[PDB]
Design a protein around this nucleic acid. Structure first.
Lengths: 32, 220, 125
RNA sequence: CCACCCGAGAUUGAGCUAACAGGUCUGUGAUGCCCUGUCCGGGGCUGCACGCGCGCUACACUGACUGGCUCAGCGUGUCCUACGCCGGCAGGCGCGGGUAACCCGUUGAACCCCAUUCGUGAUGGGGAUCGGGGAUUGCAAUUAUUCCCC
């Protein structure tokens, strides 16, 4: 395929996987 | 007189601040005065943007000479300004935790159970993926915090390892080269120092380990 | 379990994700019949009409496209939909079904499985 | 590179330093030829009958106007810009990000696609040439710097 097209394919194929796995306030205190 | 020396640290003139910054370090490292000066440090952060940079520089090399309760209070206070998205205060506070762990404090200064609360708290930042300025410093302290936690209690040390190696493998995908070099340099120094001498006490591990050997299953 | 493929045109790159389902096809979150150039609607529906509505009933495909243009994306969408099914029928259905899909899908139009190796030519001094 | 086994021999003697088509630095020939400017203001730098060449916009219905929908890549920069408020537009005021696969930027590009009006009419095609006003950069806009409205 080549360097430029494959870079966009791999980046796009990764981002479709993440929105399958996807389907608060930070802990300011450390001792409960 | 100690409070007279200390109250000039917030001074706007840099020369007056620079000597007072160096003066406080030499007095404490050379302690009953440690408790009061930390109480000054916490209240000054709560009062306030430019002065906080000088105070985090004060807290940079003054965390190691603190007792447990004040480290626990400081660990909150350094973590409060993390909620602010300002970058220079974030980097100094990130580097402040570095000087805490790089000194490798004793059991009276830093307890073993305190470090577990710190590392579990720091997991909530992971800045985005690819900014390279704090992310090198972020995984520098997670190296330094874990290597210190292992030295105190080793079998708990393997307990917290798999989650860090979850992000460390994941953060290899950042497009910056210096992320890649710093990441594996962190990971190799954990393995050469926290796992290699303590491997013999673990013994042989199967696929159905239960104790700390199960951590080694999660490493690989 | 699922299968993750790609199909391409000049710059319009597609990725397709196919798994068990009831037969819904989505592109960028939109159905296959709402993709904007409605003149070339049949190019999107060729791998569905050639194979039949029954053959796609055991699979749900979700396609993402980025780059290229309006008709370059349609040629990449129809490639990765058909290429996702021939990969899914290979790994989880017997090869006899995969051979007969790959047979009738090449004799119609060779660009549904093998890509077009045409790209813009550069200029030199 | 150093030490060593075997091996006659893991190096002993005869010849070669040299140079400046880059030049420089002011030393010499009563050396060969041949002669005895600085600052400041204003103007125009293609003003246009014509000959010869690039280009842009068009002559419309495979089209123009109005609305809606929907897709790039090479690059870019401390000058690219995000966001909020004001004006109808050019344009103002404030506050942030980015020395940069980090912000601009999921680079929301134009033809294209779908609806509306127009109906062969130098016409809602075409926009020159003009009149009046507004805004911006500049020491300065006159012979229209540039942009916007009628």
């Amino acid at each position: 395929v080549g360097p430029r097209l494959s870079r966009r394919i791999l980046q796009q194929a990764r981002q479709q996987q993440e929105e399958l796995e996807a389907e608060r306030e930070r802990t300011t205190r450390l001792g409960p | 007189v100690y409070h007279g020396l200390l109250s000039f640290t917030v001074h706007p003139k840099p020369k007056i601040r620079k000597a007072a910054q160096h003066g406080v370090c030499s007095v404490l490292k050379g302690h009953p005065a440690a408790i009061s000066t930390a109480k000054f440090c916490i209240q000054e952060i709560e009062k306030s943007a430019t002065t906080t940079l000088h105070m985090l520089t004060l807290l940079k090399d003054l965390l190691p000479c603190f007792p447990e309760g004040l480290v626990k209070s400081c660990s909150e206070t350094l973590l409060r300004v993390m909620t602010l998205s300002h970058v220079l205060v974030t980097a100094c506070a990130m580097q402040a935790f570095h000087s805490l762990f790089h000194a490798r404090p004793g059991l009276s200064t830093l307890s073993a159970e305190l470090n577990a609360q710190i590392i579990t708290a720091l997991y909530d930042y992971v800045p985005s993926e690819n900014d390279l300025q704090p992310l090198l410093a972020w995984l520098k302290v997670m190296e330094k915090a874990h290597i210190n936690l292992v030295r105190l209690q080793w079998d708990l040390g393997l307990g917290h390892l798999p989650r860090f190696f979850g992000t460390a493998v994941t953060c290899l995908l950042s497009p910056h080269s210096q992320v890649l070099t710093a990441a594996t340099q962190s990971l190799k120094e954990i393995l050469k120092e926290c796992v290699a001498p303590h491997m013999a006490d673990i013994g042989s591990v199967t696929s159905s380990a239960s104790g700390p050997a199960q951590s080694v299953a999660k490493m690989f | 379990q699922s299968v993750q493929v790609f199909g391409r045109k000049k710059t319009a790159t597609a990725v397709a994700h196919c798994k068990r389902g009831n037969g819904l096809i989505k592109v960028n979150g939109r159905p296959l019949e709402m993709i904007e150039p409605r003149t070339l609607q049949y190019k999107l529906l060729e791998p569905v009409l050639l194979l039949g509505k029954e053959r796609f009933a055991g699979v749900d495909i979700r396609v993402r496209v980025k780059g290229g243009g309006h008709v370059a994306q349609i040629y990449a969408i129809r490639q990765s939909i058909s290429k996702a099914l021939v990969a899914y029928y290979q790994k989880y259905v017997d090869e006899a079904s995969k051979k007969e899909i790959k047979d009738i899908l090449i004799q119609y139009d060779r660009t549904l499985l093998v890509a077009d190796p045409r790209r813009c030519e550069s200029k030199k001094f």
